[PDB]
Design a protein around this ligand. Sequence first.
Ligand SMILES: C[C@H](NCc1cc(C(=N)N)ccc1O)C(=O)O
Ligand SMILES: [Ca+2]
Ligand SMILES: [Cu+2]
Length: 223
Amino acid sequence: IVGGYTCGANTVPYQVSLNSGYHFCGGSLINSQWVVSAAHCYKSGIQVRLGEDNINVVEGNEQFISASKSIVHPSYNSNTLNNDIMLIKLKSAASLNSRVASISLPTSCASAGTQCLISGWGNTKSSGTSYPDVLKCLKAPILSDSSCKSAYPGQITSNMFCAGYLEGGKDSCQGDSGGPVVCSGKLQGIVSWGSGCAQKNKPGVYTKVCNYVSWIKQTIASN
Ligand SMILES: C[C@H](NCc1cc(C(=N)N)ccc1O)C(=O)O
Ligand SMILES: [Ca+2]
Ligand SMILES: [Cu+2]
């Protein structure tokens, strides 16, 4: 997260860190046994870490659970990043409490102008590399479809939406990938891609979760 603020320990209870000997992606807990992340975060040997704040120090409240299976959307395209969504089933159910809780899936899509909360342990610098120890937060609005497409001509599909600031200085970044974009208590997006980080006229692009609610429910029900 570039230009954000320190969230505060466990203030984003549904935020998870995907770990393989180091933090490489974010994710969102949607129920005691399932996590939603981005398809480009796929890889073997994933350990899901819940209840985290400082990812380099065991402070308490953390729960480390191995992923039993990762399900990348069958139509995910690694070139266009269309359908950039993946479901992760936990080996064992997480213990839900005030520090570890699930986030609700949307019933309807969000409209432009809606204010959302984006969070993660990704890079905090637009020009350079600087990973934080604690969780960072950023409040950003969903942009209009016309502004999104004018910013990324011919690269925005119906399964994506832009959120952020056209002036630059505030945006999600590498490492935040797969993380949550929550608006009015609902998971509306997944950190997917963008051109650089926090560059002017280049807002972040996110997977539009409301288009996948039925797929998520049907997939979870059969696994
Ligand atoms: C570095 C590049 N990822 C870039 C990237 C950019 C943004 C953004 N600017 N909002 C968000 C998530 C990302 O994963 C990559 O995966 O190669
Ligand atoms: Ca920790
Ligand atoms: Cu990326």
